[PDB]
Design a protein around this nucleic acid. Structure first.
Ligand SMILES: [Mg+2]
Ligand SMILES: [Mg+2]
Ligand SMILES: [Mg+2]
Ligand SMILES: [Mg+2]
Ligand SMILES: [Mg+2]
Ligand SMILES: [Mg+2]
Ligand SMILES: [Mg+2]
Ligand SMILES: [Mg+2]
Ligand SMILES: [Mg+2]
Ligand SMILES: [Mg+2]
Ligand SMILES: [Mg+2]
Ligand SMILES: [Mg+2]
Ligand SMILES: [Mg+2]
Ligand SMILES: [Mg+2]
Ligand SMILES: [Mg+2]
Ligand SMILES: [Mg+2]
Ligand SMILES: [Mg+2]
Ligand SMILES: [Mg+2]
Ligand SMILES: [Mg+2]
Ligand SMILES: [Mg+2]
Ligand SMILES: [Mg+2]
Ligand SMILES: [Mg+2]
Ligand SMILES: [Mg+2]
Ligand SMILES: [Mg+2]
Ligand SMILES: [Mg+2]
Ligand SMILES: [Mg+2]
Ligand SMILES: [Mg+2]
Ligand SMILES: [Mg+2]
Ligand SMILES: [Mg+2]
Ligand SMILES: [Mg+2]
Ligand SMILES: [Mg+2]
Ligand SMILES: [Mg+2]
Ligand SMILES: [Mg+2]
Ligand SMILES: [Mg+2]
Ligand SMILES: [Mg+2]
Ligand SMILES: [Mg+2]
Ligand SMILES: [Zn+2]
Lengths: 275, 88, 96, 65, 115
RNA sequence: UUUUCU
RNA sequence: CGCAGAUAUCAGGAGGAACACCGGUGGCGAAGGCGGGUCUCUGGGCAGUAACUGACGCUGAGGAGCGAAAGCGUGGGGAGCGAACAGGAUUAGAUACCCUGGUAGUCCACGCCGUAAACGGUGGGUACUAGGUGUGGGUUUCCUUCCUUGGGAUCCGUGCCGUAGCUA
């Protein structure tokens, strides 16, 4: 759900927050959590790799299972849905019949007290897994594997979805969330359904602290920048920089995909903005 | 819609004698049961504005009949009021 | 407690003998719930007007039952859930 | 105008079961004939229409094949 | 290539006509149109252009060796009779005639009127 | 096709 | 828009809106309006018996509610159609009538505004005043097959033509 604050202080006017009507617990299993440390956005050398990224709040990582082929043909039960900051969407706790406990992304429309099939010949119930070769055409899927035994490395954010087109030989066609079409071996695994919590977009923050806790630092505009540290800097007054916009490091906009990539001569087409 | 069984049972319960059917008391009993179960339907069915029109018409009829019973005799009026548990 | 007439169309791959056992198994729940009266008739294997679920044959069965709306709705849901069937129709036998 | 044969007490019951009577009141194109031609009363015409429509939906008559 | 049985698809719009000969299973063998014949402008609507296109298509079909053909015709009537007669006279015989036009079931919305 | 003003 | 493989045709899949033939100067609702099919709940109307209440009837300033399409707020979906805006063609001038593209909107859920030639341009209730001619529903009686717009009597709704009267 979505809740909107009633304005009572100048800073909070227009703020909103997502109503967590889908959570059942607020305590991850002690055996499945692993620690994590504040990182700061630097690297081994210590140079600032990406500007204005830092600060925030201490977070504890929880392990997730993106393999889902070690266990096959054994049913599972949906137990609980848990809070998770590390990724945009919510997650679910699974109880396998043999007794193991495991974690997966919470698909849209799922609720407590249900049955999930993970067999290679399982049903079309949402949240199930089975190889691309065995999925009927026209269904919506997520957690796509870029290739067999590679783990779900695509379409993991909230509200994303993939649509399955026809099939050919060992190849299948997928509609990318951004309109692209890509081919992948049918031997890989995937999951039916889409990521829930589709109301992520409508969140209005309106407060500096709500960004600082997440760890976003100011941006400092270009024109105000002094000429030495910037290409637009300098000038008396304020101007457009006296030169067509260029990155702060000398290289302008335009082509950004490295040509002659092994996928360059195999993949079909590119995006089109705002059709 | 009320059926023969329950309607006859209300009539026997609230009738002045075994034969009267158009008595004001039997009338009010039937109308209150109709209104009650119908509004029970409408608190789950939202936008049946025709049923809303029916509500208004039947409530007005009840009001007018209650006014008539009060005019003719107010002792029966107060007695009926405290028996049925209505306000006015 | 109203007279109901139902027809069910079944796919052709199954044999004719196994049909009825399934019917009584399905309707046992209504039999044990409201103590209903049922009559059955089986006659099928006729040319279909058009194509349904990539099948060109079907089996027509008609059953007369008197039960609750809840029971008949549950039966309809279960039958539609089952894969062996294609389509189900239910209608009142009285005026309404 | 020819009389409505269904107003008689000897007329058969109206149902979607009898393909013969379902078909004899429609043209070869599969469309429902007009009142002016069939010469039936409004009630019987409407019951025939609903019965035929249910039959077409349950796939006993062609969709104008 | 050789096939004993054939199927013809013909349709005349308000300002165009096209004819195609297809394998009963669906695969096409040859096609022709007044555009290929070499008429430009509003001349498309003239039935004579449709006759020429039909003659060219029939000659190509005979080149490939088609003997009997079935007709699945549609579209508004512009060159119906002339086209069918020319197809008959080109050397091919038609067994059955069927008119299958796509009739919408009061769906979508038609375009506005012309003023 | 279009075709202003007294 | 294509010659990077269009139009066309055969197979399969995805998705949104609306339901032709029944279908009409026919039916229903107070008016707006209303029809693909099945299931669940619900309102009103008419004919007869006439068992019951025993004048309990009409009206209605202010007041409350409903109320065509268009428009606004919050959130989704968007197949077709398409205000605004681009271009093409005619005209001396086109900011139009013609054509190719297309953003709100047309849809859905929750609140809003309460407006039309909302016309039968003719308020509601009551009793009376020549007929002929169609149409829907319910009861009765007789040629009587007792099938049958055969005919007779009666209540309600809906069309046309017609005297006395009224009307510039
Ligand atoms: Mg750790
Ligand atoms: Mg160094
Ligand atoms: Mg930065
Ligand atoms: Mg610190
Ligand atoms: Mg998350
Ligand atoms: Mg703020
Ligand atoms: Mg900046
Ligand atoms: Mg500065
Ligand atoms: Mg410099
Ligand atoms: Mg420096
Ligand atoms: Mg400067
Ligand atoms: Mg200056
Ligand atoms: Mg500037
Ligand atoms: Mg630049
Ligand atoms: Mg991109
Ligand atoms: Mg009937
Ligand atoms: Mg023309
Ligand atoms: Mg047009
Ligand atoms: Mg095509
Ligand atoms: Mg109106
Ligand atoms: Mg009713
Ligand atoms: Mg009496
Ligand atoms: Mg209102
Ligand atoms: Mg509107
Ligand atoms: Mg606006
Ligand atoms: Mg709006
Ligand atoms: Mg929007
Ligand atoms: Mg689309
Ligand atoms: Mg222009
Ligand atoms: Mg236009
Ligand atoms: Mg357009
Ligand atoms: Mg006005
Ligand atoms: Mg009057
Ligand atoms: Mg009359
Ligand atoms: Mg006169
Ligand atoms: Mg006057
Ligand atoms: Zn009849």
């Amino acid at each position: 759900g979505i809740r909107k604050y009633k304005p009572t202080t100048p800073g909070r006017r227009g703020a909103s927050v997502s109503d967590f009507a889908e959570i059942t617990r607020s305590t991850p299993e002690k055996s499945l959590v692993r620690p994590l440390h504040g990182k700061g956005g630097r690297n081994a050398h210590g140079r600032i790799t990406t500007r204005h990224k830092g600060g925030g709040h201490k977070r504890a990582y929880r392990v997730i299972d993106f393999r889902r082929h070690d266990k096959d043909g054994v049913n599972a039960k949906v137990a609980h849905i848990e809070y998770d900051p590390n990724r945009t969407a919510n997650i679910a706790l699974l109880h396998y019949l043999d007794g193991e406990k495991r974690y997966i992304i919470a698909p849209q429309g799922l609720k407590q007290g249900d049955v999930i099939e993970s067999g290679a010949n399982a049903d079309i119930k949402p949240g199930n897994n089975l190889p691309l070769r065995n999925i009927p055409a026209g269904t919506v899927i997520h957690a796509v594997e870029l290739r067999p035994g590679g783990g779900a490395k695509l379409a993991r954010s909230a509200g994303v979805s993939i649509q399955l087109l026809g099939k050919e030989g060992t190849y299948a066609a997928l509609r990318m969330p951004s309109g692209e079409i890509r081919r992948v071996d049918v031997r890989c695994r995937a999951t039916v359904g889409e990521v829930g919590n589709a109301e992520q977009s409508n969140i209005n923050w309106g407060k500096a602290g709500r960004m600082r806790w997440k760890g976003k630092r100011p941006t400092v505009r270009g024109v105000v920048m002094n000429p030495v540290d910037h290409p637009h800097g300098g000038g008396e007054g304020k101007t457009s920089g006296g030169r067509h916009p260029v990155s702060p490091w000398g290289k302008p906009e335009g082509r950004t995909r490295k040509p002659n990539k092994p996928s360059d001569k195999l993949i079909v087409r590119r995006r089109r903005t705002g059709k | 819609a009320l059926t023969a069984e329950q309607k006859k049972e209300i009539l026997g319960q609230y009738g002045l004698h075994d034969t009267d059917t158009g008595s004001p008391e039997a009338q009010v009993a039937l109308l209150t049961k109709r209104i009650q179960d119908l509004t029970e339907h409408l608190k789950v069915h939202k936008h049946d504005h025709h049923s809303r029109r029916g509500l208004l018409l039947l409530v007005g009829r009840r009001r007018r009949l209650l006014k008539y019973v009060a005019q003719v005799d107010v002792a029966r009026y107060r007695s009926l009021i405290e028996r049925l548990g209505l306000r006015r | 407690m109203r007279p109901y007439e139902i027809m069910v169309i079944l796919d052709p791959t199954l044999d004719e003998r196994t049909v009825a056992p399934s019917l009584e198994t399905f309707l046992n729940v209504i039999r044990k719930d409201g103590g209903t009266v049922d009559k059955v008739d089986i006659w099928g294997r006729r040319r279909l007007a058009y194509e349904i679920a990539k099948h060109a044959e079907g089996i027509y069965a008609v059953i007369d039952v008197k039960a609750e709306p809840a029971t008949v709705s549950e039966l309809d849901r279960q039958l539609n859930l089952n894969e062996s069937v294609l389509r189900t129709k239910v209608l009142r036998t009285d005026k309404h | 105008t020819r009389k409505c044969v269904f107003c008689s007490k000897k007329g058969q019951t109206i149902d979607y079961k009898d393909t013969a009577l379902l078909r004899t009141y429609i043209s070869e194109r599969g469309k429902i004939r007009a009142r002016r031609v069939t010469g039936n009363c409004v009630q019987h015409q409407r019951d025939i229409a609903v019965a035929v429509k249910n039959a077409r939906e349950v796939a006993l008559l062609p969709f104008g094949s | 290539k050789n096939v004993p049985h054939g199927a013809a698809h013909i349709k005349s719009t308000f300002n165009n006509t096209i004819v195609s000969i297809t394998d009963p299973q669906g695969n096409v063998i040859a096609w022709a149109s007044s555009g290929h014949v070499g008429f430009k402008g509003s001349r498309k609507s003239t039935p004579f252009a449709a006759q020429l296109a039909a003659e060219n298509a029939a000659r190509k079909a005979q080149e490939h060796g088609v003997k009997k053909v079935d007709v699945f015709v549609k579209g508004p009537g512009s060159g119906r009779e002339t086209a069918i007669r020319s197809l008959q006279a080109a050397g091919l015989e038609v067994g059955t005639i069927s008119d299958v036009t796509p009739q919408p079931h009061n769906g979508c919305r038609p375009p506005k009127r012309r003023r």
